[PDB]
Amino acid sequence: TTTTGESADPVTTTVENYGGETQVQRRQHTDVTFIMDRFVKIQNLNPTHVIDLMQTHQHGLVGALLRAATYYFSDLEIVVRHDGNLTWVPNGAPEAALSNTGNPTAYLKAPFTRLALPYTAPHRVLATVYNGTSKYAQLPASFNFGAIQATTIHELLVRMKRAELYCPRPLLAVEVSSQDRHKQKIIAPAK
């Protein structure tokens, strides 16, 4: 196909043009809700921890995909390996509240605790980038899913439920020195 490139209108040419035939495509895997729907690790933990999806690794499957969007929305599931009981408080709660049983508190039960939490921010959607301040770089303090507290938090896993992404942003593969390909060991039978 020949088109006026400057306009930037999308152009999707096909194999048919030179006698080929287009082949049926199944894209369930690339579906946003599906691909974001899985448990991923959070690395920097402390006995008192505020749930911030931006804590996900920047090159992780979810971490990178989340970053490749400007705005997002979702509910959540968390898995916590903790010593003592775990207390969670919603977005906007005083840190002091994590000390009280009246808030959702889960009594220890091996090997860990898995919970379903609702989106609790005061905004219609959240962002992975915010050009400006929230005070009278970092993101505004209100961009969180609440906080959790236990005597010791050994592991945290987060899972995005009902994810919605908006306004996509750059997503990068590892850079290549070789100038031909990026080569690495693909799994193959032993012997």
Binding site: V15, E16, G19, G20, E21, T22, Q23, V24
Partner: protein
């Protein structure tokens, strides 16, 4: 009745000692157009015709288990062979005729089989080569074996430089016997025709 004429392109082969035709694993060909060629495959009928290869000399000394093989495709000095060099991917089945001419006074028996994915057979596995598409050539009854097989493999199209799905195999089941009136040896020849030849992925010229 035992008289059979086979035609492939502008080439024919008539045999008056025919035991019939054996179809292996199928009577047809799977889709020759699937997602892996994106509609760019094409058929080349000019390649669907007979070519010849001498397999071996069946002599009285060769005992049971003596096995001769011909992996296909082999070196082809014609149109089909040029295809292999001009296209990245191809697929085709085989129409195979194997002859072993001596006379009715010879004895013995050969097994003609088409084997998918050849790998050397142990002596004991040779007692089971009849699990593959086959026929026998026994002088008292016939001088010709005829097997027809379809294309197959894990890939809908192949790179014959790198993989040979079919292998023609001839094995002595009972040694050639001779008398004053019989022939002394029997030269075995193959008459092969590639069937439903399709190519995809035209390659650049080498100069």
């Amino acid at each position: 009745d035992r008289l059979l004429t086979t035609r492939n392109g502008h080439t024919t082969s008539t045999t008056q000692s025919s035991v019939g035709v054996t179809y292996g694993y199928s009577t047809q060909e799977d889709h020759v157009s699937g997602p892996n060629t994106s509609g760019l495959e094409t058929r080349v009928v000019q390649a669907e015709r007979f070519f010849k290869k001498h397999l071996f000399d069946w002599t009285p000394d060769k005992a049971f288990g003596h096995l001769e093989k011909l992996e296909l495709p082999t070196d082809h000095k014609g149109v089909y062979g040029h295809l292999v060099d001009s296209f990245a991917y191809m697929r085709n089945g085989w129409d195979v005729e194997v002859s072993a001419v001596g006379n009715q006074f010879n004895g013995g028996c050969l097994l003609v089989a088409m084997v998918p994915e050849w790998k050397e057979f142990t002596p004991r596995e040779k007692y089971q080569l009849t699990l593959f598409p086959h026929q026998f050539i026994s002088p008292r009854t016939n001088m010709t074996a005829h097997i027809v097989v379809p294309y197959l493999g894990v890939n809908r199209y192949d790179q014959y430089k790198k993989h040979k799905p079919w292998t023609l195999v001839v094995m002595v089941v009972s040694p050639l016997t001779t008398n004053t009136v019989s022939a002394g040896q029997i030269k075995v020849y193959a008459n092969i025709a590639p069937t439903h030849v399709h190519v995809a992925g035209e390659l650049p010229s080498k100069e």
